[PDB]
Design a protein around this ligand. Structure first.
Ligand SMILES: Nc1ncnc2[nH]cnc12
Length: 248
């Protein structure tokens, strides 16, 4: 099921609607502690969804995600598709954007370490917020090799990461007419998503206790060691769980 967000006329509330809609597009059979557990595996015909994004200037891209893990596989602009250079995206390309005339395989996977190398910049120095998503859409719609990695990191954080964590949703959406640099809390949450997901699943079998702690950096910049499901990150932040059988 497809989802969309339009930057023209956007508000913090319409972004909230977009992120709720994105979360709702992701299949789950169960919740653990009131958090959706994503599917471990889906047939090809069920595995992908499109996010349609339109910038201030009415230019649109379509972004393919794997709905088992929220990972961006690639995007389409007009008659050209762009996929990450990795196994998952190669498989996605058999299912989405099939009638694109030209297909570009980007020179990196969609892994953050690869992207930052490619961008020449770390996440903390790349602006986010709604106007940043507008610029990322423009940058990718008129693809330019030297600018695309930074734009894809804005895209990832503005969609996937926001869907995974209410904190990230709220921080991005608040910036309607301005931009901001993500705090270490945003970096830390994004870094730890797989690990936190794994530990919450283990917790379900271990009376709410993690088997291994997750070190996070909180909104006050304190470094914290999280050990169970009564932690605020679990009660009041994470919004999706990566299935333990879809990690490695
Ligand atoms: N390509 C991607 N899509 C979603 N989340 C990600 N985190 C890092 N890379 C990602």
């Amino acid at each position: 099921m497809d989802v969309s967000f339009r930057l023209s006329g956007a508000t913090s509330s319409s972004y909230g609607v977009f992120i709720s809609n994105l979360r709702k597009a992701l299949p789950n059979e169960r919740k653990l502690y009131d958090i959706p557990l994503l599917r471990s595996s889906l047939p090809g015909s069920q595995r992908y969804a499109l996010i349609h994004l339109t910038n201030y200037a009415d230019e649109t891209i379509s972004v393919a995600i794997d709905v088992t893990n929220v990972y961006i596989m690639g995007y389409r602009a007009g008659d050209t598709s762009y996929f990450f250079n990795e196994a998952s995206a190669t498989e996605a390309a058999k299912y989405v954007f099939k009638d694109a005339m030209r297909k570009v395989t980007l020179p990196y996977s969609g892994n953050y370490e690869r992207l930052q190398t490619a961008a020449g910049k770390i996440r903390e120095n790349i602006p986010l917020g709604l106007p940043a998503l507008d610029s990322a859409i423009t940058t990718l719609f008129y693809y330019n090799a030297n600018s695309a990695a930074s734009a894809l990191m804005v895209l990832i954080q503005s969609t996937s990461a926001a869907a995974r964590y209410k904190f990230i949703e709220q921080q991005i959406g608040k910036r309607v007419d301005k931009t901001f640099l993500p705090s270490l809390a945003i970096i830390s949450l994004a870094n730890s998503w797989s690990a936190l997901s794994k530990q919450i699943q283990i917790a379900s079998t271990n009376n709410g206790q993690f088997e291994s702690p997750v070190v996070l950096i909180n909104a006050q910049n304190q470094r914290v060691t999280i050990t169970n499901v009564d932690a605020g990150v679990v009660t009041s932040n994470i919004a999706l769980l990566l299935n333990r059988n879809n990690m490695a």
